[PDB]
Design an enzyme around this catalytic site. Structure first.
Site, mmCIF file in Angstrom:
data_model
loop_
_atom_site.group_PDB
_atom_site.id
_atom_site.type_symbol
_atom_site.label_atom_id
_atom_site.label_comp_id
_atom_site.label_asym_id
_atom_site.label_seq_id
_atom_site.Cartn_x
_atom_site.Cartn_y
_atom_site.Cartn_z
ATOM 1 N N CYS A 130 0.838 -1.188 0.000
ATOM 2 C CA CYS A 130 0.000 0.000 0.000
ATOM 3 C C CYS A 130 0.885 1.256 0.000
ATOM 4 O O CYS A 130 2.021 1.211 -0.464
ATOM 5 C CB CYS A 130 -1.005 0.009 1.163
ATOM 6 N N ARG A 148 -3.417 -0.849 5.256
ATOM 7 C CA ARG A 148 -3.942 -1.837 4.328
ATOM 8 C C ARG A 148 -3.041 -3.054 4.120
ATOM 9 O O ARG A 148 -3.481 -4.191 4.305
ATOM 10 C CB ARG A 148 -4.298 -1.179 3.002
ATOM 11 N N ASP A 154 -8.326 3.236 1.215
ATOM 12 C CA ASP A 154 -7.548 3.720 2.336
ATOM 13 C C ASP A 154 -8.494 4.051 3.495
ATOM 14 O O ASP A 154 -9.326 4.939 3.355
ATOM 15 C CB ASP A 154 -6.801 4.977 1.890
#
Ligand code: NA
Length: 156
Positions: free
Chosen positions: A8, A14, A124
């Site tokens: 990420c 994430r 996100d």
């Protein structure tokens, strides 16, 4: 043997969750000896930082151990990992921008393994509430499950 990298932006929300979920899926399928998972971020701003406490909390409630120390993607990741999975489109193009042509085929969008949740990205969750963190886990549980199947079938 087979090495999987989840990427990420910050490697604090994430991709640490992607690593944890994928590790669990692999354990569930009795393939722990065959696969190694790691995660990293396109950006080094958070390097050295523990996973976001909200993701750790939501992770735990969902049955995962989210435990990562943020690290940036380095050039050798493109050579050393077998497959690399981007959480969103931004991550994907950043990775491709930095990836030598001969390793570009290793890079995939995480969501391109979703079979249930219709989504263009792993969103996100950093600036939202707990529901956004659960959403990340939802998408990963879908994508990671199908991913292990594709890997074992040799479909990549
Ligand atoms: Na790390």
């Amino acid at each position: 043997s087979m090495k999987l990298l989840f990427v990420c932006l910050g490697n604090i929300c994430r991709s640490p969750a992607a690593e944890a979920v994928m590790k669990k899926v692999i354990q569930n399928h009795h393939l722990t000896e065959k696969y190694i998972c790691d995660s990293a971020g396109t950006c080094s701003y958070h390097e050295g930082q523990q996973a976001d406490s909200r993701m750790r909390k939501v992770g735990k409630s969902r049955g995962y151990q989210v435990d990562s120390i943020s690290r940036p993607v380095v050039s050798s990741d493109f050579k050393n990992f077998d497959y690399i999975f981007a959480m969103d489109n931004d991550n994907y193009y950043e990775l491709l921008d930095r990836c030598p042509e001969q390793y570009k085929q290793k890079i995939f969008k995480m969501v391109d393994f979703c079979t249930t949740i219709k989504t263009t990205e792993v969103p996100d969750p950093y600036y939202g509430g707990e529901k956004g963190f659960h959403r990340v886990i939802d998408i990963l549980e879908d994508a990671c499950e199908n991913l292990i199947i594709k890997l074992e079938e040799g479909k990549l």
